[PDB]
Design a protein around this nucleic acid. Structure first.
Ligand SMILES: [Mg+2]
Ligand SMILES: [Mg+2]
Length: 288
RNA sequence: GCCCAUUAG
């Protein structure tokens, strides 16, 4: 179900418009189908700038299936990053400075585009909180370790999330639904390690991250999209370390090395903490 | 923009 309580009207309007546009069917089908069965008056205008969310939300809650809901969440997130761009620099806050940069940077539009949604995907809904939540400034750095799977589809074996204070938040071993051909060790554990530690899955870590995301947490990371992509999470507020600070994108070891002293196997929790540490680095102390 | 390379892993 869809939670439109404190959503902004602008967003709400736009969503309805899209629905109208794609002519989609809900419990009651169309927006004007709906607006006619639900409004007796001929008088009623169709421009969902007719005022109370309630006029909007009700329709919006007509739509039950996953596809339409991912659709609407998606649009609302996009809409968010859009309002994000349309506000001037002048008193914007260092964390939002950062997200500004890493969605403004021209690479973003292509890299962080995830559709089509497998409908194993989780789409964040922070696109429907109120503004004060949307502009929330709290960070948590993700990172993954993946191994190429039989499918040629990459897969999730180790995930780490880390908080603003480098306190470690989700460190885990995942064993993928589909088997795997190449474990890419050095930078990995071995399959023997995981199967026993079978417990964690991807839907589990979506479950786990969802309350952070809906409270509007800024994810932070380095080439964070490869991560999101294996995690099957599409959430607008992001900070990519590569993108922020020559077309070529940097590598983490050189940024730290560049930022502060740091060929050995990779560690997603050190990774996450390092990413986080750079983000904080800019936020408190100004850099370039 | 696909391949490439950097990033990732
Ligand atoms: Mg990374
Ligand atoms: Mg890593």
């Amino acid at each position: 179900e869809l939670k439109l309580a404190t959503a902004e009207k602008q967003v709400l309007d736009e969503l309805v418009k899209l629905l109208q546009s794609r002519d989609l069917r809900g419990e009651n089908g169309n927006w004007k189908e709906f607006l006619h069965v639900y409004d007796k008056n001929a008088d009623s205008p169709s421009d969902p700038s007719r005022r109370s969310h309630e006029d909007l939300v009700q329709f919006l809650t007509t739509f039950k299936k996953k596809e339409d809901l991912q659709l609407l969440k998606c649009h609302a997130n996009h809409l968010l990053i859009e309002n994000l761009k349309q506000e001037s620099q002048d008193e914007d806050t260092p964390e939002q400075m950062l997200v500004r940069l890493t969605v403004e940077h021209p690479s973003y539009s292509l890299d962080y585009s995830f559709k089509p949604y497998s409908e194993d995907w989780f789409v964040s809904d922070v696109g429907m909180k109120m503004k004060k939540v949307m502009e929330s400034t709290n960070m948590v750095a993700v990172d993954c370790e993946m191994v190429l799977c039989e499918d040629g589809t990459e897969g999730l074996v180790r995930v780490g999330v880390v908080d603003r204070d480098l306190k470690v938040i989700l460190d885990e071993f995942v064993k993928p639904n589909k088997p795997v051909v190449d474990y890419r060790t050095d930078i990995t554990g071995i399959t023997a390690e995981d199967i026993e530690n079978a417990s964690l899955s991807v839907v589990d870590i979506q479950e786990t991250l969802q309350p952070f995301l809906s409270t509007g947490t800024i994810l932070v990371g380095h080439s964070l999209n490869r991560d999101l992509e294996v995690l099957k999470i599409d959430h607008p507020k992001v900070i990519d370390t590569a993108l922020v600070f020559k077309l070529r994108r940097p590598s983490l070891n050189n940024l730290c090395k560049s930022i502060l002293g740091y060929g050995v196997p990779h560690d997603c929790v050190h990774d996450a903490s390092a990413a986080m540490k750079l983000a904080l680095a800019v936020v408190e102390k100004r850099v370039d």
